[PDB]
Write a protein that binds this ligand. Structure first.
Ligand SMILES: CC(=O)N[C@@H]1[C@@H](O)[C@H](O[C@@H]2O[C@H](CO)[C@@H](O[C@@H]3O[C@H](CO)[C@@H](O[C@@H]4O[C@H](CO)[C@@H](O[C@@H]5O[C@H](CO)[C@@H](O[C@@H]6O[C@H](CO)[C@@H](O[C@@H]7O[C@H](CO)[C@@H](O[C@@H]8O[C@H](CO)[C@@H](O)[C@H](O)[C@H]8NC(C)=O)[C@H](O)[C@H]7NC(C)=O)[C@H](O)[C@H]6NC(C)=O)[C@H](O)[C@H]5NC(C)=O)[C@H](O)[C@H]4NC(C)=O)[C@H](O)[C@H]3NC(C)=O)[C@H](O)[C@H]2NC(C)=O)[C@@H](CO)O[C@H]1O
Ligand SMILES: CC(=O)N[C@@H]1[C@@H](O)[C@H](O[C@@H]2O[C@H](CO)[C@@H](O[C@@H]3O[C@H](CO)[C@@H](O[C@@H]4O[C@H](CO)[C@@H](O[C@@H]5O[C@H](CO)[C@@H](O[C@@H]6O[C@H](CO)[C@@H](O[C@@H]7O[C@H](CO)[C@@H](O[C@@H]8O[C@H](CO)[C@@H](O)[C@H](O)[C@H]8NC(C)=O)[C@H](O)[C@H]7NC(C)=O)[C@H](O)[C@H]6NC(C)=O)[C@H](O)[C@H]5NC(C)=O)[C@H](O)[C@H]4NC(C)=O)[C@H](O)[C@H]3NC(C)=O)[C@H](O)[C@H]2NC(C)=O)[C@@H](CO)O[C@H]1O
Ligand SMILES: *[C@@H]1O[C@H](CO)[C@@H](O[C@@H]2O[C@H](CO)[C@@H](O)[C@H](O)[C@H]2NC(C)=O)[C@H](O)[C@H]1NC(C)=O
Ligand SMILES: *[C@@H]1O[C@H](CO)[C@@H](O[C@@H]2O[C@H](CO)[C@@H](O)[C@H](O)[C@H]2NC(C)=O)[C@H](O)[C@H]1NC(C)=O
Ligand SMILES: *[C@@H]1O[C@H](CO)[C@@H](O[C@@H]2O[C@H](CO)[C@@H](O)[C@H](O)[C@H]2NC(C)=O)[C@H](O)[C@H]1NC(C)=O
Ligand SMILES: *[C@@H]1O[C@H](CO)[C@@H](O[C@@H]2O[C@H](CO)[C@@H](O)[C@H](O)[C@H]2NC(C)=O)[C@H](O)[C@H]1NC(C)=O
Ligand SMILES: *[C@@H]1O[C@H](CO)[C@@H](O)[C@H](O)[C@H]1NC(C)=O
Ligand SMILES: *[C@@H]1O[C@H](CO)[C@@H](O)[C@H](O)[C@H]1NC(C)=O
Lengths: 227, 227
C-alpha cells in the first residue's frame, strides 16, 4: 500500500507527504511499470517515449508487442518497464528532462509533459531552480512515481506494481478488470475504500500478478474478460 | 589517412581490407562524428537517430542546434557525435540493430538502414548469422565507420574526423567547402588523388579543425564561404 495522491499534486503550494513520492516500504529495488499516452510529434515512438521516461526502446517494444521503431498512434496508452528503487526514503525512477521552451513550469512538466507520472512537489524538492526561474535549457531531475510490492502484496501473488494514468470515466473496478486483478487489490494498493473517488490525471498503483497486457485498450473490452 | 572504400562494399563477396573498417592507426579512442539523413517515420528525431547510431539525443540536438525532441525534416543530413575506439585492429563505433522484418539483409541494413555508415562485410565479420539465415528479432552488432585523427592530421590542426555520407553531385572540393577545410586535406584523409572518383552512397572521411557546422545544407551555400 501507498497513499493516494488525492489531487494534492494540483496545488503546488501543498506539501502533503504523498506528493514527494511513494514511500520506501519494501525491497530497495524491483522491476516496475509506468504507463504513458503516445503524444505526437514529440513522444510517439519507443525511442522518444523511452528517452522521456528513461527506459529502453527494446523494453517498451516488448512490453507493447510492437517494434522498437514503429510510430504509436496518438493517445494510445503504452506500458513502460522501469526499475524502481529507493532514494531518500522514497521509491522513484529517475529520468532527466531538458526544458524546451521558456514558459514551461514544474506543474506543466509534471502534469502535461510527464502526464502526472511525477509531481510539481517532487520536482521542486529534487531540483535547484525556483519555480519562477526556469528557462529553456535547464536540466531537471525527474522523480517518476513507481513502487515495489510490499511483502503482503508479494505474498498475495503480486509480482509488480504498475503506475496507471487514469482517464476520465474509469474507476478502480474498470482498471482492475484490464489487468485481471480484484478491485479490492487496487483499493488496497492505494489506501482507498470502495467509496473513495479516484480522479483522472492522477496516477494510481495497480498490483500485477503477471506482466501487463500488451494492448491496454482492448484489454478493457468486456469480451476480453470473465469467460 | 584511411583507405577509401571505393565501392567494395556493394559486392558482399568482396573481401577487400577496407570493408572490414578503418584501421586503428592512432589513439585508441577519440571524439568523432557520423552523419545521417533523417528518414521518416522511423529515424527522424534525435531520439530515434540516436537509438539507431548509439549516440545520445542531447549530443545530436547540440550538434545540430535543435531541441532533443523536435522532428527533423526528411532527408536533412544531421551530425551525430560518437566515440570512436579501436577494437580488433579497427576503429569503429558500436551500435546494435534488431531486425524488424524478415527479408532484411546485411546489405540492406548496411546500405539502406545505416545509409552506408557500415558495410555488409563488417556486419558479417562481427555477427554469427549466415547471410541467408537472418530473421526478424535477430540482434546485430553494428560496427559503424569512424576514425581518429592520425598524429600527422592532429599536427595540422585537425581535431576530429567526420564520416560524411556522400550524395549524388558532390565532390571532394564541394565537401571540403562545407567544413572550411582544404580539398587536399579530404583527399589525404581518404588516400585519394585529385582525379580519384568518389561515389555517392559511399562514406568519406572529412578532417575537421572545429566542430562541424550545425546546419550542413546551408553550409554548402557559396555565400557561406570565401568572404
Ligand atoms: C485472497 C486470499 O488469499 N484470501 C485468503 C482466504 O482465502 C483464506 O481463507 C481460507 O480459504 C481457504 C480456501 O478457500 C479455506 O479452506 C477451505 O476450508 C474448508 C474448511 O476447513 C475446507 O473444507 C473442508 O474440507 C475437509 C477435507 O475435504 C472436509 O473434511 C471432511 O469432513 C467430513 C465431514 O463433512 C469428514 O467425514 C466424517 O468423518 C467422521 C470421522 O472423522 C465420521 O464420524 C463417524 O460417523 C459415524 C456414523 O456415520 C459414527 O458411528 C456412529 O457412532 C454412533 C455413536 O457411537 C453410533 O450410535 C452409530 O451406530 C454409529 N454408526 C455407525 C454406522 O457405525 C462414528 O462414531 C463417527 N466417528 C467419530 C470419531 O465421531 C463422519 O461420519 C464423517 N462424515 C461424512 C459425511 O463423511 C471427513 O473425515 C473429512 N475429511 C478429511 C480428509 O478430514 C470438510 O467437510 C470441509 N468442511 C467444510 C465446512 O466444507 C476446504 O477444503 C478448504 N479449501 C482449501 C482449498 O483448502 C479456509 O477455510 C479459509 N479460511 C477462512 C478463515 O475463511 C484466509 C485464511 O487462510 O486468508 C486470506 O488471506
Ligand atoms: C599546410 C602547412 O602547414 N604547410 C606547411 C608549409 O606552410 C611549410 O612551408 C613554410 O611556410 C612558412 C610560412 O609561409 C614559410 O615561412 C616564411 O619563410 C620566408 C622565408 O624564410 C620568410 O620570409 C623571410 O622573412 C625574413 C624576416 O622578415 C626576411 O628577412 C629579412 O631579409 C632582409 C633582406 O631581404 C634582411 O635585410 C638585409 O640584411 C643584410 C644584413 O643582414 C643587409 O646587408 C648589408 O647591406 C649593406 C648595404 O645595404 C652592406 O653595406 C655595403 O657593403 C659593401 C661591401 O663592403 C660596401 O661596398 C658598401 O659601401 C656598403 N654600403 C653601405 C651603405 O654601407 C653590408 O655589408 C651588408 N651586410 C652584410 C653583413 O652583408 C641588407 O642590406 C639588408 N637588406 C634589406 C633589403 O634590408 C633582414 O636582415 C632580414 N630580417 C631578419 C629579421 O632576419 C626575409 O627577407 C624573408 N625572405 C623572403 C624570401 O621573403 C617568412 O617570414 C616566413 N613566414 C612565416 C610566417 O614564418 C616557410 O619558408 C615555408 N617553408 C618552405 C620550405 O616552403 C612547410 C615547412 O615548414 O611545412 C608544411 O607542412
Ligand atoms: C536517483 O536520483 C537520486 C537523487 O534524487 C539518487 O540518489 C543520490 O545519489 C547520489 C550519487 O549519485 C548521492 O550522492 C546522493 O546522496 C543521493 N541522494 C539521495 C537522496 O539518496 C539515486 O542514486 C538515483 N538512482 C538511480 C538508480 O539512478
Ligand atoms: C494536466 O494535463 C492534462 C493532460 O494530461 C490536461 O488536460 C488537457 O487539457 C486541455 C485543456 O486546456 C484539453 O484541450 C486537453 O484535451 C486535455 N487533455 C486530455 C487528455 O483530456 C490538463 O489541462 C492539465 N491540467 C490539469 C489542471 O489537470
Ligand atoms: C565494440 O565491439 C567490440 C566487438 O566487436 C568490443 O570488443 C570486444 O569486447 C569484449 C568485451 O565485452 C571482448 O570479450 C572481446 O574480445 C572484444 N573483441 C575485440 C575484437 O576486441 C568492444 O569492446 C566494443 N567497444 C565498445 C566501446 O563498446
Ligand atoms: C543503397 O541505399 C540507397 C539509399 O541510401 C539506395 O538509393 C535509393 O534507391 C531507390 C531505388 O530503389 C530510390 O527510389 C531512392 O530514392 C534512392 N535513395 C536515394 C537517397 O537516392 C540504393 O538503391 C541502395 N543500393 C545501392 C546498390 O546503392
Ligand atoms: C507480438 O506477439 C506475437 C505473439 O502473439 C509474437 O509472435 C510476435 O513476434 C510479436 N511481435 C513483436 C513485434 O513483439
Ligand atoms: C541554437 O543556436 C543559438 C546560437 O546561434 C543558441 O543561442 C540557441 O540556444 C540554440 N538552440 C538550440 C536549441 O540548440
Amino acid at each position: 500500500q501507498q497513499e493516494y495522491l488525492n489531487n494534492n499534486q494540483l496545488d503546488c503550494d501543498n506539501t502533503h507527504n504523498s506528493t514527494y513520492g511513494n514511500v520506501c516500504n519494501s525491497v530497495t529495488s524491483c522491476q516496475s511499470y509506468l504507463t504513458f499516452k503516445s503524444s505526437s510529434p514529440e513522444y510517439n515512438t519507443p525511442s522518444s517515449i523511452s528517452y522521456l521516461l528513461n527506459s529502453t526502446p527494446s523494453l517498451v517494444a516488448k512490453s507493447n508487442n510492437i517494434t522498437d521503431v514503429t510510430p504509436i498512434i496518438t493517445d494510445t496508452m503504452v506500458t513502460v518497464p522501469v526499475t524502481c528503487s529507493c532514494s531518500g526514503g522514497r521509491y522513484q525512477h529517475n529520468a532527466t528532462y531538458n526544458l524546451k521552451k521558456t514558459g514551461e513550469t514544474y506543474f506543466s512538466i509534471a502534469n502535461n509533459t510527464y502526464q502526472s507520472l511525477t509531481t510539481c512537489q517532487a520536482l521542486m524538492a529534487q531540483n535547484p531552480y525556483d519555480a519562477k526561474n526556469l528557462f529553456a535549457g535547464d536540466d531537471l531531475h525527474v522523480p517518476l512515481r513507481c513502487a515495489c510490492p510490499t511483502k503482503k502484496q508479494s505474498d498475495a501473488g503480486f509480482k509488480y506494481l504498475l503506475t496507471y494514468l487514469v482517464s476520465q470515466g474509469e474507476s478502480p473496478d474498470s482498471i482492475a478488470e484490464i489487468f485481471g486483478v480484484d478491485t479490492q487489490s487496487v483499493l488496497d494498493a492505494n489506501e482507498l475504500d470502495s467509496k473513495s473517488v479516484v480522479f483522472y490525471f492522477t496516477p494510481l498503483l495497480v498490483p500485477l500478478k503477471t506482466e501487463p497486457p500488451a494492448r491496454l485498450q482492448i484489454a478493457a473490452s468486456h469480451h476480453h474478460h470473465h469467460h
